[PDB]
């Protein structure tokens, strides 16, 4: 896929890339 708005541990990645 491409867009993946998810967080990891203590970082939230809103970017689609």
The rounded distance, in Å, linking the Cα atoms of 1 and 16 is 10
Report the alpha-carbon distance of residue 1 to residue 10 in Å, rounded: 23
Query: Are the C-beta atoms of residues 14 and 5 closer than 8 Å to each other?
Result: yes
Q: How far apart are CA 2 and CA 16, in angstroms?
A: 6
Which residues partner with 13 through β-bridges?
A: 6
Question: Would you call 17 helix, strand, or coil by DSSP?
Answer: coil
In 1-17, beta strands by DSSP E: 6-8, 11-13
Q: Is 10 helix (H, G, I), strand (E, B) or coil?
A: coil
Token look-up 């990891």 returns 8
4 near 13, Cβ under 8 Å? Answer: yes
Task: Name the method of structure determination.
Answer: NMR
CA-CA-CA-CA dihedral for 5, 8, 11, 2, to nearest 10: -30
């Amino acid at each position: 896929k491409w867009c993946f708005r998810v967080c990891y541990r203590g970082i939230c990645y809103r970017r689609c890339r």
